[PDB]
């Protein structure tokens, strides 16, 4: 099975799904955070760094617009984990600006 978050394969559906998650939920669950990390990890393993970047970039925009402190930290946590995987897989970290 191709990398998916909660069943959503196409980036269109992932966007909608993540948009709902961040805006609707006020305090994210740890399991949801980990599924997002797991998903990002799977993009790397299946050699789809384009979509990874698209996903990271989108989450950054929404989680940093969020006045909810917890989302700001949630993005940092997600990105830290992704960077570890990239460090071991490629010996480099993702350029994020």
From Swiss-Prot:
Where are the residues of the annotated region Protein interaction domain?
1-97
Free-text tissue specificity from the UniProt record: Ubiquitous.
Show the disulfide pairing.
none
The domain of life is Eukaryota
Its localization reads: Nucleus
> Function of this protein?
Deoxycytidyl transferase involved in DNA repair. Transfers a dCMP residue from dCTP to the 3'-end of a DNA primer in a template-dependent reaction. May assist in the first step in the bypass of abasic lesions by the insertion of a nucleotide opposite the lesion. Required for normal induction of mutations by physical and chemical agents.
Q: Give the domain note.
A: The C-terminal domain is necessary for protein interactions.
Q: How does it assemble?
A: Interacts with FAAP20. Monomer. Interacts with the DNA polymerase zeta which is composed of REV3L and MAD2L2; the interaction with MAD2L2 is direct and requires that REV3L is in its closed conformation. Interacts with POLH, POLI and POLK.
Q: Which family does it belong to?
A: Belongs to the DNA polymerase type-Y family.
Report what the protein is called: DNA repair protein REV1
Taxonomic lineage is: Eukaryota, Metazoa, Chordata, Craniata, Vertebrata
Span within the parent record: 1153 to 1249 of 1249
